[PDB]
Write a protein that binds this ligand. Structure first.
Ligand SMILES: [Cl-]
Length: 148
């Protein structure tokens, strides 16, 4: 009831392999590639690209500065997937639980990035995370257009 799921697949022009490299091992590059959206990506514990690593994000949503602390809960290298669980931050005032999965289809033929949110709202009247999903799609477009 308070439970929800949201899925968006977007086709990318850029190399899926580089998208996965970013999201697994070089996540700090997103501050450079989507500087309107992301002001800081700071590793707090562990190492980049390892399950159990803890990462702090400074980001802007609707011109408001927000933060989150996330743990990397899962990595699947064969499917090119990484699962982030948000443990602290502005989102935790609206959601009890929030999990973000990013998965890159690297056929090479055509490449795409699928974003999945699994969340538990604190109340029934809390909104579905549409704005966050728009935010994630904007970062994807910023990343794929960064090379040009
Ligand atoms: Cl690992």
């Amino acid at each position: 009831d308070l439970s929800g799921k949201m899925v968006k697949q977007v086709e990318i022009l850029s190399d899926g392999i580089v998208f996965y490299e970013i999201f697994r091992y070089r996540l700090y590059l997103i501050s450079e590639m989507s500087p309107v959206n992301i002001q800081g990506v700071d590793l707090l514990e562990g190492n980049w690209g390892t399950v159990g690593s803890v990462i702090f994000f400074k980001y802007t949503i609707d011109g408001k500065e927000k933060t989150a602390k996330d743990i990397v809960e899962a990595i699947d290298e064969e499917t090119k997937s990484v699962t982030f669980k948000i443990v602290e931050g502005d989102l935790m005032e609206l959601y009890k639980t929030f999990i973000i999965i990013v998965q890159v289809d690297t056929k090479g033929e055509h490449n795409s990035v699928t974003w999945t949110f699994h969340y538990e709202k604190l109340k029934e009247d809390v909104e579905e995370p549409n704005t966050l999903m728009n935010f994630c799609i904007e970062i994807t477009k910023d990343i794929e257009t960064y090379h040009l």
